[PDB]
Each structure stands twice: as structure tokens, then as C-alpha cells.
Paper text:
In the structure where the buffer component imidazole was found in the active site, it was positioned in between Tyr74 and Trp246 in a similar way as the histidine side chain. This affinity probably explains the difference in enzyme activity between histidine and arginine, but not the poor quality of the other aromatic side chain amino acids as [name] substrates. The [name] crystals usually adopted the space group P63 where the packing seemed to be dependent on the crystal contact formed by the second CoA moiety of a CoA disulfide molecule, formed by two CoA molecules covalently linked by a disulfide bond between their thiol groups, at the active site. The crystals of the P63 space group invariably contained a CoA disulfide. The first CoA of the CoA disulfide bound to the canonical position and aligned well with the other molecules bound in this position except for the 3ʹ-AMP moiety that was poorly defined. The second CoA of the CoA disulfide was positioned in a cavity formed between the helices α3, α4, and the β-sheet segment composed of β5, β13, and β6.
Acetylhistidine is synthesized from histidine and acetyl coenzyme A (Ac-CoA) by a histidine acetyltransferase ([name], EC:2.3.1.33). We find that [name] adopts a double-GNAT (Gcn5-related N-Acetyltransferase) fold where the N-terminal domain binds acetyl-CoA and with distinct active site conformation allowing the binding of histidine in between the two domains. Our results indicate that [name] catalysis occurs via a ternary complex, and the ternary complex is likely stabilized by the oxyanion hole generated by the residues Gly123 and Leu124 of the β-bulge.
Numbering used by the authors: 47 to 371
The structure:
């Protein structure tokens, strides 16, 4: 039997927040960002958050955000209520959003997205793979980490097993971020596929996108400003549904470059910066890094720092497709 009422595609408002939460159970294994980000998304000037409604009720959501100086649309948040799946809803919503972008933003030439699902024949036919990073996910209680880290690092140093390597400060206000990310050699030799990936969001390295990044409260670290080889990027932690008790936060660190020892020392630096602000909370810390470094960093986190590995090796894929008419 066909549905009594038609689908209606509308721009999201704050009125639908609770309905959106109610269709989002279990998404991203409890690491879903949308509960914490929905209000922000509605304020973003180049973003359209589209809801599919049936008979006045929200059954699906998709975000399209225009970045890269008008040339790219990033697709995020695609989801259909569990009780409405398998009927083509996501396909219809994707088509509505793509037509909306083509109508309102004629300058958009490509769509981009990131995901960690295994790429099958269907993905490889439709998308280009721009780059990929390995994904390392660990968990810790912030207070417990802070209480033991001094002793841990002391024992690691006395044993000659590990001593933090020097790292260098990176100030956005001071211009260090722009001097790094606008360098053609940093783009070629450090950034994965010449792209900034920040908490799953890809940006071409341009001044326009640096303004967007500057507003997010990111923290950066580098091995050397004068001779950059490893650059790390920490996104401010945010609440996630995992655990159901409100105590969990997601701490995303993107690591760019090939020197595993510098990724280790910069990871430690970010943990020491961020954990004091999370006293009383629990942390899902997800590190993205060059694939050949994953085993080294997994051992550093598990054996060196005593952190619990949540899952085995997976990959973050940056995918791109051309816009067609």
C-alpha cells in the first residue's frame, strides 16, 4: 500500500531538534556529532540542512555546505529514521539536495564527503578517492589519565623507552597556521592528498577556508615551523551519546605527516592540553594519521600510555564526485 501523504523537503529549524534526535539512535556507534552540532549547523551561512517530512513528521536529514570558495559542496549527516529505511528515502533526499545546490550555487563543481565504510565496486565507480587516513580510537577517563601520566612518563624516560621530543607552537592569531597551510611544500609533503581534514571535514588549503577554521577553536602543533614535517590539529571536544549518562566527550586529533615519533609527541602534547579541561568526564579520542604509522601509535597508546583500544584498524576515506546536469 502506498503512503497516504507525500514527502515534503523543507529547511530545518530549531523546532525539529527533538524529532531529529529521535531518528538518530545508534548512529556512528554512539559517536554521533549531530546532537551537539545541530544548533550550530542552523547558524552556518553557506549550509542548508534539509529535512524530509511525511505527514508533518521528520523522517530524514541531510546537510549540504558550500566551501572551497564556492567550488565544493560537502555532504554530511545523511540519515533516515530506522522505521523508514529501505524505501528509497535517502535516495530521494540526496537528489533533492543535489538539485538545490545546483540551482542556488552554480559555482559548485564537485561534492565531497568522508566515511569509514569499506569501499566496494559501487563506490569506486562513482567517487574519486582523494586521500585516506588510518583511524585509531582509544578511550580514557580524563581524571585517571591526568593522575597517572606523570608516573607513566617518568618510568618511560628512566627506561629509555620514550621521552617526548621537542615540538613547536603554532598560533592562529600570530599567523603561523597560514604560513604552514598556504605553503605549497607543506601541502605536497605534509597534508594528506594536499587536503586539510578536520574532524571529518575536508578543506582545500586556502585563505578562505583558513577563516572558517579560525572560528572553530582549534589547537595546532608542529615539529618545526621552519622545517615542517608533522602537523597536528585538535578539535575542541564535544558531547556524544555514548554511555547514555552524558559524561562522554569526543576528542578528534588529525595528524598530518610521516614521522611517527613526532605524531607520538604531538599526540601527548594535545592530551596534556585537553584533558585538564575534561575533569570528571570520559573521552573517546580518535586519531587520524598516515596508515603506515597506525601500528606504532596503537602500541604507543596501549603499551606506552596504558590507554584502551576501542576498535581495530579502519580507514577514513575522502571521496569526491563531479556535479552533473
Amino acid at each position: 500500500e502506498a503512503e497516504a501523504e507525500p514527502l515534503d523537503f523543507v529547511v530545518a529549524t530549531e523546532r525539529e531538534f527533538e524529532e531529529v534526535l529521535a531518528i538518530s539512535g545508534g548512529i556512528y556507534g554512539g559517536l554521533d556529532y549531530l546532537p551537539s552540532r545541530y544548533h550550530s549547523w542552523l547558524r552556518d551561512p553557506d549550509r542548508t540542512v534539509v529535512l524530509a517530512k511525511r505527514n508533518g513528521g521528520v523522517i530524514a536529514l541531510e546537510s549540504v555546505n558550500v566551501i572551497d570558495a564556492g567550488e565544493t559542496v560537502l555532504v554530511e549527516g545523511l540519515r533516515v529514521a530506522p522505521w523508514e529505511r529501505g524505501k528509497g528515502v535517502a535516495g530521494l533526499l540526496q537528489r533533492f539536495c543535489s538539485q538545490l545546490v545546483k540551482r542556488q550555487h552554480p559555482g559548485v563543481k564537485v561534492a565531497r564527503l568522508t566515511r569509514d565504510d569499506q569501499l566496494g565496486p559501487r563506490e569506486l565507480k562513482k567517487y574519486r578517492l582523494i586521500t585516506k587516513q588510518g583511524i585509531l580510537l582509544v578511550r580514557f577517563n580524563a581524571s585517571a589519565l591526568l593522575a597517572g601520566l606523570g608516573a607513566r612518563l617518568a618510568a618511560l624516560r628512566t627506561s629509555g623507552t620514550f621521552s617526548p621530543l621537542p615540538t613547536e607552537a603554532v598560533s592562529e592569531a600570530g599567523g603561523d597556521v597560514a604560513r604552514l597551510l598556504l605553503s605549497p611544500s607543506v601541502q605536497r609533503d605534509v597534508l594528506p592528498g594536499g587536503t586539510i581534514i578536520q574532524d571529518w571535514q575536508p578543506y582545500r588549503p586556502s585563505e578562505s577556508n583558513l577563516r572558517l577554521l579560525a572560528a572553530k577553536g582549534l589547537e595546532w602543533r608542529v615539529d618545526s615551523r621552519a622545517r615542517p614535517r608533522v602537523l597536528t590539529l585538535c578539535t575542541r571536544p564535544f558531547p556524544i551519546p555514548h554511555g547514555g549518562d552524558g559524561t562522554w566527550r569526543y576528542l578528534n586529533i588529525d595528524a598530518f605527516g610521516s614521522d611517527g615519533a613526532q605524531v607520538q609527541s604531538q599526540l601527548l602534547w594535545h592530551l596534556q592540553r585537553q584533558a585538564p579541561r575534561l575533569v570528571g568526564l570520559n573521552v573517546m579520542c580518535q586519531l587520524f594519521l598516515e596508515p603506515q604509522l597506525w601500528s606504532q601509535l596503537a602500541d604507543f597508546c596501549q603499551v606506552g600510555l596504558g590507554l584502551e583500544l576501542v576498535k581495530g584498524y579502519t580507514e577514513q576515506y575522502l571521496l569526491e564526485a563531479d556535479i552533473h546536469h
